[PDB]
Symmetry: D2
Subunit: 132 residues, 4 copies
């Protein structure tokens, strides 16, 4: 008996009345709430979410420019071992900023890894396929 | 967050050196080993398999085609779950339970290609 | 070689401002607009849609009686060779009334045949799987 | 009406009695027979297959043994792969080779017994 199966799934999210789309993901088994931002490339974590994930903020090195302001400027790049939104994605790029971030952001780099990603007016539709 | 998913699967079984195909199924949550018989229609269960499944052999009524009692199996899972599947239990000795065409035909895809039996299915997921 | 494939698909429909869900199907190659009615069984076609599909209303025998909101109506049973809504369904039961009907109805007998059918927060979601 | 669909498919190949796996692929619409070689990375095309694909053998540049690198616009094996790396050997080649670079792109790839099983999912 050789057995193989694929899970083909969808997640549909209705636009919030505030005009944004939000999505809950499990990042290293921890539920984190993201705002979808098509202007973001990698994930942007709030300091509070980074700490929930067990990052030591004092050890991070802040080398990744994420703002055009002088002064407060660089975020610390991180890699997220596991991000589960329907399927599991591995080693996802992110950074942690400096504390002005109200809510963590999910950007195009992760979104573009879904088989399908569409924003159609008031809906966001994600289609995926995972082995097993 | 609305979420939905479908499992799309395949089961591939290599022909046994004895010339037959065998498949393990979970029938009402019990693992049962079937021999595939394309000449069979419904499932033929051995008495011992029937008893594992909780059938009381003394209550079954055994008519002809030697004699068999018709039964219905609540659940047969082979990749996906099939419900209320027809079978019978014979009073004569049956060496191994038989899986026939009535169940096999229900798969989205079913092919015997020389020495392989290939079953394709799609099931909703919870 | 062995090759086998399945098309796994979804249709998502937003609730009309009038409170109903509508779906366009291709019935014997002809686009028909249906209202979804979970309180219907077989398809109910308007006289005009039946005529679009080439039914001769004078040849139909109105042998059936449906118990509606307005009570008892006469109908002629029909079979629709092909109904495509994502996948193709074959020999689908329907009937045509004598005139009580503003828009054709798609009911539970067809909707139950989809792998998935869900109505959630002003959205109707149909999931299907078709061989090849 | 938002509509989306995915084609989910499998290809199963029985080991040839000669010990190898062979796979037919459509390369720029042309059916080409490949031997699977887990030791290969990119595709290796014979000169004859290259010609079937309309490559002019006199224009190829044999760089780096040397081979001539090429890019295949379309390789279909169940699903379509685009701009796949290959080369044409000058040293002889009996049968074109499909290697790990292309095989790894499949959702599932398994050599089980005397079977090779490829599972894919393609957006539509
Ligand atoms: Cl990423
Ligand atoms: Cl979009
Ligand atoms: Cl995916
Ligand atoms: Cl049990
Ligand atoms: Cl027996
Ligand atoms: Cl049955
Ligand atoms: Cl199935
Ligand atoms: Cl509207
Ligand atoms: Cl179909
Ligand atoms: Cl029906
Ligand atoms: Cl379906
Ligand atoms: Cl794939
Ligand atoms: Na028996
Ligand atoms: Na016995
Ligand atoms: Na060569």
């Amino acid at each position: 008996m050789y057995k193989w199966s694929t899970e083909v799934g969808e997640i549909i999210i209705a636009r919030n009345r505030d005009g944004h789309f939000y999505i809950n993901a499990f990042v290293n088994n921890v539920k984190i709430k993201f705002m979808v931002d098509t202007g973001a490339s990698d994930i942007a974590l709030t300091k509070e979410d980074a700490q929930k994930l067990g990052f030591d903020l004092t050890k991070l090195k802040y080398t990744r420019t994420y703002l055009t302001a002088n002064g407060e400027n660089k975020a610390a790049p991180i890699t997220l071992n596991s991000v589960v939104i329907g399927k599991e994605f591995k080693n996802i790029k992110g950074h942690v900023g400096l504390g002005d971030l109200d809510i963590s952001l999910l950007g195009m780099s992760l979104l573009e890894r879904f088989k399908g990603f569409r924003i159609d007016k008031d809906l966001l539709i994600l289609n995926y396929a995972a082995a097993l």
